[PDB]
């Protein structure tokens, strides 16, 4: 049951028609997330999941339009009928409102009870069909939910907040960290309740307090994102996955996203959203929008956003930057940024379901850095002659030992140790000996009338003068890395 203001915006014959729809909804008081998420789901289906166009199907129709050179020729965008999307929309509303009874739960001064929210979660929980033995992609949107009843972990949380909007509940909102989503609610908006899975132990109906308390990356020591309705649109925008298969991405779904991120950027709703500022910078690198800022400019906004709004406890802000440096073959600035990545992670404790960030750290230490160094060593006969890199490298390994400290699980093992020695070896003994490790002479500075380094970790302190030697001790370091 949409408004006539919404209905006249259709049909969506192009990306610009979608971008237009999204702009109009942002200007309204409560943006219709259900509508918007369906539109993203619809278009993505044809643009990525099932590109083949049917024969004897009057319901659907496509719009020809020139494609850019070198490719040239035309491209056929799926025209969103109002008749199609109106039906889908009304099924969801009828499903949710048919499933629940709002007049039972007396929201005394608009107070949605924890009782009430657990029901809405359970309505989404009982109707879904989970892809267990396969990792299905493109199962994020309410299109996927209404059509196939398949949703990824994060999409379940989003689906609840959709239903909460479908029942007029303004106070229920999507919470998320860098790799997990739940719901945030209350009068002052400080309740937490799990509404999904992660990878595992099924725990819905609980607060996220124990997660915060144990200093795990998945919950960010409390410094996670609380979304207003406008930020929830930026999430569904970010959830667009253009990949047809492993190595190919759809150009239309790129442009669609890249355009839609800029719109939000202008309206100001990427201000408290670091990961979105990185994704737009990643897109700018691939295809730079004409008359717009640079990736670096956009990456540094995401860093400051995390520093100001999120207590400088986010990790990906720095990794976004180092990757750009890495793909540009600027070896000094990349390690520097990976050392800054270590600065944040040192003050965590590695718990079991912080799986995703380990994988990223592992790849830097054991694939990307040695790749860059193998390039650098071949390029030499320089960043290897430049002693500033080795100070950054040691501080990157420093934070991972410190990360590991205070955990129930070990981080480092023999597999890691090989590449440390390989990377250590890439710098000459003349270069590495110049670095000075000190405790500190005097604290502070005052207004009156070689390069320094400092380890926080026990392990790097344990091998202080082993790292600085003339000839490398490959056997001894491997052992001293691992400990109880
Ligand atoms: C990406 C899907 N997604 C989640 O995985 C997710 C789901 C949740 F529940 C919570 C958070 C979540 O993470 C993100 N939340 N908001 C925005 N983006 C998220 N992504 C997570 C992975 C991501 C962004 C990309 N990662 C970076 C790599 C970028 C590499 N690029 C593409 C290369 C460019 O080369 C030209 C970092 C490793 C640096 C961070 C959300 C959007 C539904
Ligand atoms: Na630690």
Swiss-Prot record:
**UniProt-reported outcome of changing residue 281 to P:** In parathyroid tumor
Q: What is the effect of changing residue 155 to D?
A: In MEN1 and parathyroid tumor
Q: What is the effect of changing residue 138 to Y?
A: In MEN1; familial and sporadic cases; almost no effect on JUND-binding; no repression of JUND transactivation
Summarize the impact of residue 306 to P: In MEN1; no effect on histone methylation; almost no effect on JUND-binding
Q: Where is this region: Interaction with FANCD2?
A: 211-381
Gene Ontology molecular functions: chromatin binding; double-stranded DNA binding; four-way junction DNA binding; phosphoprotein binding; protein-macromolecule adaptor activity; R-SMAD binding; transcription cis-regulatory region binding; Y-form DNA binding
Give the recorded effect for residue 427 to S.
Answer: In MEN1; sporadic; with Zollinger-Ellison syndrome
GO-annotated cellular components: chromatin; chromosome, telomeric region; cleavage furrow; cytoplasm; cytosol; endoplasmic reticulum lumen; histone methyltransferase complex; MLL1 complex
Q: Which InterPro entries match?
A: Menin
UniProt-reported outcome of changing residue 316 to A:
Reduced interaction with KMT2A
| Phenotype upon changing residue 152 to V | In MEN1; also found in isolated hyperparathyroidism
Which spans are transmembrane here? none
A single GO BP: MAPK cascade
Q: Which UniProt keywords apply?
A: Chromatin regulator, Disease variant, DNA-binding, Nucleus, Phosphoprotein, Repressor, Transcription, Transcription regulation
Effect recorded for residue 25 to K: In parathyroid adenoma and MEN1
Say what the protein does. Essential component of a MLL/SET1 histone methyltransferase (HMT) complex, a complex that specifically methylates 'Lys-4' of histone H3 (H3K4). Functions as a transcriptional regulator. Binds to the TERT promoter and represses telomerase expression. Plays a role in TGFB1-mediated inhibition of cell-proliferation, possibly regulating SMAD3 transcriptional activity. Represses JUND-mediated transcriptional activation on AP1 sites, as well as that mediated by NFKB subunit RELA. Positively regulates HOXC8 and HOXC6 gene expression.
Disease affiliated with this protein = Familial multiple endocrine neoplasia type I: Autosomal dominant disorder characterized by tumors of the parathyroid glands, gastro-intestinal endocrine tissue, the anterior pituitary and other tissues. Cutaneous lesions and nervous-tissue tumors can exist. Prognosis in MEN1 patients is related to hormonal hypersecretion by tumors, such as hypergastrinemia causing severe peptic ulcer disease (Zollinger-Ellison syndrome, ZES), primary hyperparathyroidism, and acute forms of hyperinsulinemia.
Name recorded for this polypeptide: Menin
Protein species of origin:
Homo sapiens
Taxonomic lineage is: Eukaryota, Metazoa, Chordata, Craniata, Vertebrata
């Amino acid at each position: 049951g949409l408004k006539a203001a919404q209905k006249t915006l259709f049909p969506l014959r192009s990306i610009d028609d979608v971008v237009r729809l999204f702009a109009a909804e942002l200007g309204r008081e409560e943006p219709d997330l259900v509508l918007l998420s369906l539109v993203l789901g619809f278009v993505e289906h044809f643009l990525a999941v099932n590109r083949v166009i049917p024969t004897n199907v009057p319901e659907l129709t496509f719009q020809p339009s020139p494609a850019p050179d070198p490719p040239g020729g035309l491209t056929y965008f799926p025209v969103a009928d109002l008749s199609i999307i109106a039906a889908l929309y009304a099924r969801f509303t009828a499903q949710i409102r048919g499933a629940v009874d709002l007049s039972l739960y007396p929201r005394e001064g608009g107070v949605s009870s924890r009782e009430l929210v657990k029901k809405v979660s359970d309505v989404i929980w009982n109707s879904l069909s989970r892809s267990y033995f396969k990792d299905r992609a493109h199962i994020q949107s309410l299109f996927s939910f209404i059509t196939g009843t398949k949703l990824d972990s994060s999409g379940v949380a989003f689906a609840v907040v959709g239903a909460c909007q479908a029942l007029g509940l303004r106070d229920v909102h999507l919470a998320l960290s860098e790799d997990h989503a739940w719901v945030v609610f209350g009068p002052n908006g400080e309740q937490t309740a799990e509404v999904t899975w992660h990878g595992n132990e099924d725990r819905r109906g609980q607060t996220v307090n124990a997660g915060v308390a144990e200093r795990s990356w998945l919950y960010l020591k409390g410094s996670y994102m609380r979304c207003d309705r406008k930020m929830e649109v930026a999430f569904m925008v970010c959830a667009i996955n253009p990949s047809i298969d492993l190595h190919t991405d759809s150009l239309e779904l790129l442009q669609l996203q890249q355009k839609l991120l800029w719109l939000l950027y202008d309206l100001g709703h990427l201000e408290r959203y670091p990961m979105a500022l990185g994704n737009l910078a990643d897109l700018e690198e691939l295809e730079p929008t004409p008359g717009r800022p640079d990736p670096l400019t956009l990456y540094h906004k995401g860093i400051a956003s995390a520093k100001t709004y999120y207590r400088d406890e986010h990790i990906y802000p720095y990794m976004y930057l180092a990757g750009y440096h890495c793909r540009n073959r600027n070896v000094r600035e990349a390690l520097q940024a990976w050392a800054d990545t270590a600065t944040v992670i040192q003050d965590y404790n590695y718990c079991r379901e912080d799986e995703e960030i380990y994988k990223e750290f592992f790849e830097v230490a054991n694939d990307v850095i040695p790749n860059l160094l193998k390039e650098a060593a071949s390029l030499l006969e320089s960043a290897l002659q430049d002693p500033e890199c080795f100070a950054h490298l040691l501080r990157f390994y420093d934070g991972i030992c410190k990360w590991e400290e205070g955990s129930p699980t070990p981080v480092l093992h023999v597999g890691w140790a090989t590449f440390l020695v390989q990377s250590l070896g890439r710098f000459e003994g003349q270069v590495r000996q110049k670095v000075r490790i000190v405790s500190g002479t005097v604290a502070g500075t005052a207004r009156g009338p070689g390069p320094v380094l400092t380890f926080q970790s026990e392990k790097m302190k344990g091998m202080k003068e082993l790292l600085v030697a003339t000839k490398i001790n490959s056997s001894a370091i491997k052992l001293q890395l691992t400990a109880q």
